[PDB]
């Protein structure tokens, strides 16, 4: 499609919210590029309403070891998050960058 492969991946992402409070397992799910934030798998319907638009901006992956990922999106670029495991963290990079894979500049 006009963005890449319309992926849809869901599951808890262990996010680093602050130095004090890291490891935070929070429910995350990627829909058509929009990676939204929830506090539970039943919360998926509404959540905090806030969502990451990884399509218009970039899905960041670096940390040169197991588990590496972050999200930079519209208005606010700052999402540091770890995963249940490494291929878990991979999985996201996978879905995200497969769904945004056609956007080299910006989903607009």
Curated annotation (Swiss-Prot):
Disulfide bonds: none annotated. Residues 9-101 form the PH domain. Widely expressed. The PH domain binds the small GTPase ARF1 and phosphatidylinositol-4-phosphate (PtdIns4P) with high selectivity, and is required for its recruitment to the trans-Golgi network (TGN). Interacts with GTP-bound ARF1. Interacts with SACM1L and VAPA and/or VAPB to form a ternary complex. Plays a role in regulation of vesicular cargo transport from the trans-Golgi network (TGN) to the plasma membrane. Regulates Golgi phosphatidylinositol 4-phosphate (PtdIns(4)P) levels and activates the PtdIns(4)P phosphatase activity of SACM1L when it binds PtdIns(4)P in 'trans' configuration. Binds preferentially to PtdIns(4)P. Negatively regulates APOB secretion from hepatocytes. This is Pleckstrin homology domain-containing family A member 3. It comes from Homo sapiens. The lineage of its organism: Eukaryota, Metazoa, Chordata, Craniata, Vertebrata. The gene is PLEKHA3. The chain holds residues 1 to 100 of 300 of the full protein.
